[PDB]
Design an enzyme around this catalytic site. Structure first.
Site, PDB file in Angstrom:
ATOM      1  N   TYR A   1      -0.936  -2.018   4.318  1.00  0.00           N
ATOM      2  CA  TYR A   1      -2.037  -3.047   4.726  1.00  0.00           C
ATOM      3  C   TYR A   1      -1.506  -4.228   4.602  1.00  0.00           C
ATOM      4  O   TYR A   1      -0.838  -4.605   3.871  1.00  0.00           O
ATOM      5  CB  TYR A   1      -2.841  -2.744   3.305  1.00  0.00           C
ATOM      6  CG  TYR A   1      -4.646  -3.380   3.612  1.00  0.00           C
ATOM      7  CD1 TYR A   1      -5.076  -1.946   5.140  1.00  0.00           C
ATOM      8  CD2 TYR A   1      -5.055  -4.154   3.545  1.00  0.00           C
ATOM      9  CE1 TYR A   1      -6.508  -2.348   4.764  1.00  0.00           C
ATOM     10  CE2 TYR A   1      -6.342  -4.758   4.141  1.00  0.00           C
ATOM     11  CZ  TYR A   1      -7.142  -3.753   4.567  1.00  0.00           C
ATOM     12  OH  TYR A   1      -8.582  -4.236   4.643  1.00  0.00           O
TER      13      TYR A   1
ATOM     14  N   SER B   1       3.410   2.415   1.464  1.00  0.00           N
ATOM     15  CA  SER B   1       1.693   1.448   0.223  1.00  0.00           C
ATOM     16  C   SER B   1       1.193   2.715   1.521  1.00  0.00           C
ATOM     17  O   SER B   1       0.477   4.150   1.351  1.00  0.00           O
ATOM     18  CB  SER B   1       1.512  -0.105   0.320  1.00  0.00           C
ATOM     19  OG  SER B   1       0.752  -0.119  -0.375  1.00  0.00           O
ATOM     20  N   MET B   2      -0.210   2.463   1.967  1.00  0.00           N
ATOM     21  CA  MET B   2      -1.205   2.710   2.639  1.00  0.00           C
ATOM     22  C   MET B   2       0.135   3.875   3.897  1.00  0.00           C
ATOM     23  O   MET B   2      -0.777   5.075   4.345  1.00  0.00           O
ATOM     24  CB  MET B   2      -2.155   2.267   3.123  1.00  0.00           C
ATOM     25  CG  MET B   2      -3.619   1.980   2.053  1.00  0.00           C
ATOM     26  SD  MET B   2      -4.722   0.485   3.202  1.00  0.00           S
ATOM     27  CE  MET B   2      -5.697   0.554   2.327  1.00  0.00           C
TER      28      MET B   2
ATOM     29  N   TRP C   1      -0.256   4.510  -1.662  1.00  0.00           N
ATOM     30  CA  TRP C   1      -1.946   4.597  -2.732  1.00  0.00           C
ATOM     31  C   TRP C   1      -2.734   5.016  -1.280  1.00  0.00           C
ATOM     32  O   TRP C   1      -1.611   5.820  -0.137  1.00  0.00           O
ATOM     33  CB  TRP C   1      -2.321   2.804  -2.063  1.00  0.00           C
ATOM     34  CG  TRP C   1      -3.527   3.037  -2.309  1.00  0.00           C
ATOM     35  CD1 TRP C   1      -3.978   3.377  -3.998  1.00  0.00           C
ATOM     36  CD2 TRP C   1      -4.539   3.408  -1.567  1.00  0.00           C
ATOM     37  NE1 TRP C   1      -5.483   3.240  -3.751  1.00  0.00           N
ATOM     38  CE2 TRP C   1      -6.131   3.135  -2.915  1.00  0.00           C
ATOM     39  CE3 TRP C   1      -5.416   2.830  -0.079  1.00  0.00           C
ATOM     40  CZ2 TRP C   1      -7.697   3.457  -1.827  1.00  0.00           C
ATOM     41  CZ3 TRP C   1      -6.266   4.005  -0.168  1.00  0.00           C
ATOM     42  CH2 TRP C   1      -7.525   3.601  -0.499  1.00  0.00           C
TER      43      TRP C   1
ATOM     44  N   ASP D   1       4.845  -2.264 -10.235  1.00  0.00           N
ATOM     45  CA  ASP D   1       3.693  -2.077  -8.861  1.00  0.00           C
ATOM     46  C   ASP D   1       2.269  -2.628  -9.578  1.00  0.00           C
ATOM     47  O   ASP D   1       1.411  -1.870  -9.925  1.00  0.00           O
ATOM     48  CB  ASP D   1       3.717  -0.933  -8.772  1.00  0.00           C
ATOM     49  CG  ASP D   1       3.103  -0.735  -7.200  1.00  0.00           C
ATOM     50  OD1 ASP D   1       2.065  -1.755  -6.671  1.00  0.00           O
ATOM     51  OD2 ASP D   1       3.578  -0.311  -6.314  1.00  0.00           O
TER      52      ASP D   1
ATOM     53  N   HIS E   1       5.199  -3.951  -5.969  1.00  0.00           N
ATOM     54  CA  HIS E   1       5.080  -3.578  -4.769  1.00  0.00           C
ATOM     55  C   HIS E   1       5.630  -2.933  -3.501  1.00  0.00           C
ATOM     56  O   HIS E   1       6.259  -2.191  -2.970  1.00  0.00           O
ATOM     57  CB  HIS E   1       3.218  -3.707  -4.805  1.00  0.00           C
ATOM     58  CG  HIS E   1       2.799  -2.631  -3.588  1.00  0.00           C
ATOM     59  ND1 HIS E   1       3.118  -1.445  -4.119  1.00  0.00           N
ATOM     60  CD2 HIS E   1       1.936  -3.131  -2.373  1.00  0.00           C
ATOM     61  CE1 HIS E   1       1.953  -0.848  -3.166  1.00  0.00           C
ATOM     62  NE2 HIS E   1       1.466  -1.686  -1.957  1.00  0.00           N
TER      63      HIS E   1
END
EC number: 3.1.1.101
Length: 262
Positions: A59, A132-133, A157, A178, A209
């Site tokens: 993101y 991540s996303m 995520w 993270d 992260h």
């Protein structure tokens, strides 16, 4: 013998190096099909057709965050597409849709005589990666397309951590410290939900992260593991079984788990 085996017999040294055995070239996708933008990295001397991997950022993030994987994987015998999403604010499901659209376009370009990757791709052997996303999107892609051969998301995520339907061999890179998608609430619950696949969990000591992004201080280990996982599962290459399934016994790893691997 294995028709998908490429390159020389691997060593810890050859897998930890910045570059693999093959020369890499790249191009920008002139007309992205179902995603924002893309860069395709490919080997010029792999000696046979290779599988394709699509990589998605997080993101707010762009190709720069995951670019390092392009040359790293391509130099070992893969066609890699790094993408920018239609919007930097796209959610995991949309990221998955765009990741698969990028794989579809790599397959289309394999059959386009003007493309630098004409005839270089085995379109039946594909993998998914992302941060991540984009890592969540990779898991969604694996859940929805079980013919995918491997998945290796990083610091994932997702809306839900239930990926119990995933049968695709999945390596989860996690970052110990993270604060965006904490390990105990995202990466580790995701890992624990998968009961029908070859799977691995590799947590980087002290990592933020961005611990597996471009510019990270663990490219030797992270790159070794990513390439080994893709080699073992996308190429069925048992020369990489130990590198893929082993506990690295590395001072950089603060948590390691694996199941149904070797």
């Amino acid at each position: 013998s294995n028709p998908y085996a490429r390159g020389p017999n691997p060593t810890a040294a050859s897998l930890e190096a910045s570059a693999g055995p093959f020369t890499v070239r790249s191009f920008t996708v002139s007309r992205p099909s179902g995603y924002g933008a893309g860069t395709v990295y490919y080997p010029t001397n792999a000696g046979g057709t290779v599988g394709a991997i699509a990589i998605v950022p997080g993101y707010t993030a762009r190709q720069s965050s995951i670019k390092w994987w392009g040359p790293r994987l391509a130099s070992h015998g893969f066609v890699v597409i790094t993408i920018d999403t239609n919007s930097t604010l796209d959610q995991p499901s949309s990221r998955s849709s765009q990741q698969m659209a990028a794989l579809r376009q790599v397959a289309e370009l394999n059959g386009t005589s003007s493309s630098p990757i004409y005839g270089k791709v085995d379109t039946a052997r594909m993998g998914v990666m992302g941060w991540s996303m984009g890592g969540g999107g990779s898991l969604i892609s694996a859940a929805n397309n079980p013919s995918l051969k491997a998945a290796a998301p990083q610091a994932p995520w997702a809306s839900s951590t239930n990926f119990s339907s995933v049968t695709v061999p999945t390596l989860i890179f996690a970052c110990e410290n993270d604060s965006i998608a904490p390990v105990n609430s995202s990466a580790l619950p995701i890992y624990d939900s998968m009961s029908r696949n070859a799977k691995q969990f590799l947590e980087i000591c002290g990592g933020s992260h961005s611990c597996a992004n471009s510019g990270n201080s663990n490219q030797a280990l992270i790159g070794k593991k990513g390439v080994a996982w893709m080699k073992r599962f996308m190429d069925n290459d048992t020369r990489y079984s130990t590198f893929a399934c082993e506990n690295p016994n590395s001072t950089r790893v603060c948590d390691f788990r694996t199941a149904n691997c070797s």
